[PDB]
Write a protein that binds this ligand. Structure first.
Ligand SMILES: NC(=O)CC[C@H](N)C(=O)O
Length: 415
């Protein structure tokens, strides 16, 4: 089956990239290649990242506009409220699990204010300019006059603000009635034409993933020794992801929906494999919607409203990764964590996951926020960036999975 062959190649691309990067790192690696050859060697991964980032804006905007315009305003409100509750609860559970695992295994045994960060999140939720929000996000810095906070739009897509605007605009189109049907059709057609482009990009995805992983483990120095140093951190992250995706989320699905959760997960295994490969939830969004609608029988209006929102707001993997990283860095620096600091870590990780952009390496940009909020040093992030390519991929799975089951849950609530 060609459809399964594509995903098999996408997954095997990670293994092939690991092998290629280990082979290149041996026999000199970066020093033997030199910057001129290093850039060319790593370029295909960068090209894949560029394509994935390009598709996100139209894909998310059109999908959300259509999904919101496809539901009654009251039904949409109830569904969105329950979906937000599910996302928040699952993210909090992931954060708590990560903190507990980090405190039990102790992987470390071997600046912006928090209020300003939350106000920046609120500002990004309501973009000041729709065109600017497509490639910029509000961010607060300080002038020492007393540190007075002054904000500006820095680079980085404001995907959360565009998501909110898309939902509101879809609701407005629904309320318009016959007059909004033309725009609903326009945005559905744009969404489908974007699904076509995503499907085409998925064919380049294997080569891009291979070269991305190979470059990211060639850039790593002393791969064996660095893995020996970060083994416990990697174990904590992957074990937390496994527990959350295989025990916690299916347990919630079973409790709220007596149907077997693992059959639902098998129904989307292919989207999960694509998410592990590309490490981007948005690239899996088309295939995930297809699988939940076709394999799991989730209604079209539930799926195409929930999954696009969850791909940006619901990131359980990101929250677990950030909590584990925070506790690991605190242990490295020998700072004890109390209930106040643990709760701060949990809340800040939830907010950061909500603010994350859902792109490869998109979860490390906001870990510094947690480290600053807990008064932990920010330099240690240098270590985490080395392992990201692996951990991030795991996160993506637990991210996209968190969406799918949620839809499967909410649909069952509708019935
Ligand atoms: N570490 C993370 O979860 C970042 C986001 C993740 N790469 C995704 O797109 O789902």
């Amino acid at each position: 089956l060609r459809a399964n062959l594509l995903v098999l190649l996408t997954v095997v691309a990670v293994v092939a990239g690991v092998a290629l990067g280990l082979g290149v790192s041996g026999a000199g690696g970066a020093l033997a290649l030199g910057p001129e050859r290093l850039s060319a060697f790593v370029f295909p991964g960068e090209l894949l990242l560029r394509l994935l980032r390009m598709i996100i804006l139209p894909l998310v905007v059109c999908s959300l506009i259509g999904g919101a315009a496809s539901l009654d305003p009251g039904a949409l409100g109830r569904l969105g409220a329950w979906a937000l509750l599910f996302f928040l609860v699952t993210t909090l559970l992931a954060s708590a699990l990560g903190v507990g695992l980090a405190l039990a295994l102790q992987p470390g045994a071997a600046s912006k204010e928090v209020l300003d960060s939350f106000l920046d999140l609120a500002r990004n939720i309501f973009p000041s300019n729709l065109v600017s929000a497509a490639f910029r996000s509000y961010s607060t810095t300080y002038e020492e006059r007393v540190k007075v906070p002054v904000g500006q739009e820095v680079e980085g897509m404001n995907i959360l603000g565009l998501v909110v605007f898309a939902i509101v605009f879809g609701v407005a189109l629904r309320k318009l009635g016959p007059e909004g049907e033309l725009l609903i059709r326009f945005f559905n057609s744009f969404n489908e034409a974007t699904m076509v482009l995503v499907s085409w990009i998925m064919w380049y995805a294997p080569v891009g993933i291979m070269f991305l992983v190979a470059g990211k483990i060639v850039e790593m120095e002393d791969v064996g020794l660095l893995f020996a140093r970060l083994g416990k951190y990697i174990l904590c992250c992957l074990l937390g992801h496994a527990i959350h995706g295989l025990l916690v989320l299916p347990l919630i699905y079973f409790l709220f929906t007596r149907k077997n959760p693992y059959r639902f997960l098998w129904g989307i295994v292919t989207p999960l494999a694509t998410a592990f490969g590309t490490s981007s939830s948005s690239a899996t969004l088309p295939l995930m919607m297809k699988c939940v609608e076709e394999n799991n029988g989730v209604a079209k209006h539930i799926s195409r409203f929930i999954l696009p929102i969850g791909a940006t707001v619901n990131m359980d993997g990101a929250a677990l990764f950030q909590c584990v990283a925070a506790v690991f860095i605190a242990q490295l620096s020998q700072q004890s964590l109390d209930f106040v600091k643990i709760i701060t870590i949990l809340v800040t990780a939830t907010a950061s996951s909500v603010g994350a952009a859902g792109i490869p390496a998109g979860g490390v940009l906001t870990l510094a926020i947690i480290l600053e909020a807990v008064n932990l040093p920010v330099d240690h992030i240098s270590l985490i960036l080395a392992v990201d390519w692996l951990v991030d991929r795991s996160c993506t799975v637990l991210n996209v999975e968190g969406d799918a089951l949620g839809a499967g849950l909410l649909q069952n609530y509708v019935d």
